[PDB]
Each structure stands twice: as C-alpha cells, then as structure tokens.
Ligand binder design. Structure first.
Ligand SMILES: [Ba+2]
Ligand SMILES: [Ba+2]
Ligand SMILES: [Ba+2]
Ligand SMILES: [Ba+2]
Lengths: 123, 123, 123, 123
C-alpha cells in the first residue's frame, strides 16, 4: 500500500494508491480533491477499470500527504464500499421477490393462454 | 540560501528556496504570489514534506526578485513559525491541564467502579 | 453493609453507610434528604474523603428506613458511579486525541524552530 | 502546614490552617465558604489576632478538601497580602508627600506667627 497525492499538468489534485514501475505509473481508487474541510470526487466516473495507467511526463509533483487527509480518504473509501454492498443486497432481494410473485402469477393459467404466452415470447 | 521567483507552465508565481542540481529542482517553503501590496499563500497545503522536487521542463522563467518582496517573504515566513510555536505551547498546556484534572477525578473511586472502568476500557 | 437514616442536631436527614465502633461513628456515601417523591443531595461536596467521622453526641435519632427509600438510594448511588465512569472515558479519549494531534503538528518543524521551542519551553 | 475544612455547629464551612493540640484547636487565616465557582469571606472581620482558639466540642466534621479549593484558597490568600502591601506603600508615599508639603508651607512664616502657632498647638 502506498498513498501519495499528486498534481496533474491540468492543475488538479489526485489522491489514491500509486505504483511507479517503469516511469509510467499505475493509479488505483483515484480521487479528485476539490478545495472547499475537504471534498473528494471520483476521478474517472465513466470507467469501471480498477487501475489506470498514466505517464510520469504528465504529472508535476508527487508527494506524501498529511494524516488528516489519509483518515478522510480511508473513511470515504470504506463508506463507498459499504453503500455499494448495501445496494447489492437491496437489488438481490427485490429481484427475488419480483421473481417469486411473477412465478405465482404465471402458475394460474390455462392451456391456450400458455400457448399464446409461448408464441408471443418467441416473437 | 537562494531565493528565486519562478513562473510555472500553469501560469502562477512561486517564491521560495530553490536548489538546481541535475535539471530537476528542489523547492523549499514555496509560496504562491497572488496579484492583489502583495499576498502570499501556501503552495501545497495538503503535504507536510519539507522539500518538493519538480522538473525544469515544467517551469518557464526563474529570476531573482527585488528586495521588497524578499523582506515581505522573510517577515511572513517568520510570523508563520512564531504562530506555530505559540500554538504548540497552547496545546501542550491544555493537554497537561486536562490530564491533571482527569487524574484527580479518577483518584476518587471505588474498587467495583475501578473494576468496571478496567473492563469497559478493555472493551 | 448497614444503611441507617439519622437526624442531625442541625435538623437535617442523612442517609448512608453507617459504622458505630466506639461512640464516634463513621459515615460513607452520605446523602442529605430534601423533603420535596424524594430528592437526595451530596452531604460534603467539598471533600473527596470516602469516610467521615462524627460524634454520637451530635446526632438525635438513628433508625432503619423503609424499602422504597433504600431502592431510591441504591439507584442514585449506582447512577452516579456510572456517570463518573462515563466521564472518565470521555476525558481519556479527548486527551489521547489531543496528544496525537499535537504530536503530528509538532512533527513538521525546522531545526531553528525546534531550538526556539525548547528555549521557550525552558523559560 | 495543614489545611482542613470543617463544619461548625452553627452550620457554616470554615477553611484555614488548623492545629489540634489538646482537643481545643487553633485556627489561622480562617475563611467562611459561601455556597454560590466558590466565594470566600473573612471569618472574624472584627479582630486582628493571627490565631483563634476554639473547642472541638463545637465542631461537627473536620476533613481534608479537594485540590481545586486548595488552589482557590491559596490564590485568594496571596492576592489579599499583595493588596495589603500595595496599600501600605500608597499610604506611606502619601504621608511623606503631605509631610514635605507641610514642612515647606511652615518654613515661610514670621516670628509672631510662629509664637501664635506654638501657643495654639499647646492649647
Ligand atoms: Ba515530473
Ligand atoms: Ba525552462
Ligand atoms: Ba444520641
Ligand atoms: Ba466533633
């Protein structure tokens, strides 16, 4: 584990897990720090990739942060995971309930209705 | 000691102690100069590192400043240290007073209460 | 254990743990009973001594109380201990947090600033 | 030195230096504690005696106090002495100034006026 803040050539502050292998660096769980206490936002809200590879030629400064920001970052990154798991449980329960109710509703049906059901499902 | 102002590719003015060793330069006690008299702000308010290493390919101009800005910078950099030391003394005194008062409060206690204290502290 | 209410020559009612050895009696956890349900107050709010020794020549009547007052006295004397322990935990946690924050704040300092810190602490 | 609070048969709280020799006790710098923070008042504001001798048959409880009251008592008993010394200096300076001014005023006088002065002073 290695948490190091950095400043991008664009002019923004990125905090996350860093790995510098061969110049090009790998970033995990990156967060944009908005100056405003502190506010953190997702860096790449359009991708699900765990790691993002960038080039060291496009980063200005890489430095270790103070402990308060470390605590805030850890708290935020565990709250997000907890909420994600809670939503997964909610979705699974709703899916199970809907499937059971649909099964019971479909159970009471006639033969011709079942044939029409199959035909329209095929269509 | 070597104080030289510089202009970054972003378009900001940085004043601080500079050391140019092998192209990449080391900066200590950097300050952003805001055009407004003069106003100075911390450059990296999220890190406690004494020195920051940047690349000469990302700096436009490095030049020595006039004496008025030198005087203002020295005054500001000593005022900050003085205030830091004063706050350290304040915190130490408050901690000592709180510890002493807690010790006297805990002194007056019963055996069963002491056992409950130890159990809940262990929990 | 022996709980016996008594009436003082002053004209007040004291309830607490009693021990009559050689005329002079020892009282622990004494409480003044205010006639108003029942209201209890500390008897000696300026001392931390567990036991107080008084003379039997200065007490009018010593008698055992009814069960309702015993229950109220026990409830009050456990609530006070519980609140005392809770406040001890609060104070310890606050002291630990303040000490940790002061340590991190002092960690980031310069040599001359450290020397000034030591000199002013000595003063 | 021995500071012990006590409760009198009258029903008041006395704090001061105590000495128990032969039953009868000696009290120095006694203060009445008024329940209201804490407020202290002189016990015997009509006498200048340093020590007052009372009988143990007229005191209910004698117990050691907590540290906060000790600190307050010491602070008050040094402030009173400091103010007393300051007033002594004020009075001495005023007396010296008045004596000097009277001496200079009396210096310029005639022989018959001096004789009348002596006669009326004798009267
Ligand atoms: Ba770089
Ligand atoms: Ba250049
Ligand atoms: Ba009796
Ligand atoms: Ba007595």
């Amino acid at each position: 584990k290695n948490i190091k803040i950095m400043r991008l050539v664009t002019g923004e502050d990125i905090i996350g897990n860093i790995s510098e292998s061969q110049g090009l660096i790998t970033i995990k769980k990156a967060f944009v720090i908005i100056p405003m206490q502190l506010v953190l936002s997702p860096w790449q809200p359009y991708t699900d990739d765990k790691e993002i590879v960038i080039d060291d030629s496009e980063v200005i400064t890489i430095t270790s942060p103070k402990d308060d920001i470390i605590k805030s970052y850890e708290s935020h990154t565990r709250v997000l995971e907890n909420k994600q798991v809670e939503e997964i449980l909610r979705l699974e329960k709703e899916i199970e309930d809907l499937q059971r109710m649909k099964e019971q509703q479909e159970l009471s049906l006639t033969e011709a209705s079942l044939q029409k059901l199959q035909e329209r499902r095929d269509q």
